[PDB]
From a paper:
Only a few parasite proteins are exposed on host cell surfaces, and these have mostly diversified into large protein families, allowing a population survival strategy based on antigenic variation. More ubiquitous across Plasmodium species are families of small variant surface antigens (VSAs). These include the CIRs of [name] and the VIRs of Plasmodium vivax, often known as the “Plasmodium-interspersed repeats” (PIRs). To determine the structure of a member of the [name] family, we focused on proteins from [name], often known as CIRs. These consist of an N-terminal extracellular domain ranging in size from 28 kDa (236 residues) to 133 kDa (1,331 residues) in the AS strain.
Crystals formed for [name] and contained three copies in the asymmetric unit. A complete dataset was collected to 2.15 Å, and the structure was determined by Sulfur-SAD phasing, using anomalous scattering from the sulfur atoms found in the five disulfide bonds and six methionine residues in each monomer. A complete model was built for residues 5 to 242. Another 20 residues, which connect the ectodomain to the predicted transmembrane helix, are missing from the C terminus, suggesting that this domain is connected to the membrane through a flexible, disordered linker. The CIR ectodomain adopts a compact α-helical structure, arranged into two distinct clusters of helices. The N-terminal half of the ectodomain is formed from five tightly packed helices connected by long loops largely lacking in secondary structure. This packs against the C-terminal portion of the ectodomain, which is folded as a cluster of three parallel helices, connected by short loops. Five disulfide bonds stabilize the fold, supporting the hypothesis that the CIRs are surface proteins, because disulfide bonds are characteristic of proteins located in the oxidizing extracellular environment. The surface opposite this attachment site is dominated by a long loop that links helices 1 and 2. This is one of the most flexible regions of the domain, containing the residues with the highest crystallographic B factors.
Numbering used by the authors: 5 to 242
Write the structure that this text describes.
Amino acid sequence: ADNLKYVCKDIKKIDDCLQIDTIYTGVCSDDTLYSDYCPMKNGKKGQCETNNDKISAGFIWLLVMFEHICDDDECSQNEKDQYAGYAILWLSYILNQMPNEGIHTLKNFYTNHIETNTNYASHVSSASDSNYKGIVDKKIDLMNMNKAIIPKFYDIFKSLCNMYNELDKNEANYANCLKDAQNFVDEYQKFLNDNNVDTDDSSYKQILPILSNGYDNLIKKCNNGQHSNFPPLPTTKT
């Protein structure tokens, strides 16, 4: 679905607002953006004192926003799985950026900082479901199974998000869509080659739908205001 239009927008919004000194992607458009999701401090309302508090609140804000993409905020099993995967991919990227954190500390960070935030159980609809915990655990395990490629894979996802942002502003006149799609497929082919990615690996097959569905939707949307022959997404290392 055209879900990446919103996912890419929401991730950019939370990135600029993370307020963490060591991580800088931009200026916060709204200082109160995730304040509603800050963890409690000594039984009192949270203000987000630590970097872990801000990441935790930012992650919950993401999940809450992604669920809004579903009709009536009622996500199917497939939507819950897809949105948990996007949020946990972003979380892996953040932990990889943070010094003294990483994909190796992701499971620990989730249990000690996300499940620990009182706003996770009350605002994320599926938080208490055992089916949801299984989805989250699988996504965390997938990040660990692919830990060596996850930071570079995220850069490819970011390049895909840049095309979605361009389409969002140009609307029916994204004249550079074909040129950008060709640069994207070449950049992705280089990612497979440089990292010796076996696209038939079980773990890689479960993160690949983020790019394969995302790219397929993007070129279908560009071909709504133009008429171009877009290159197919690379299938293997070359």
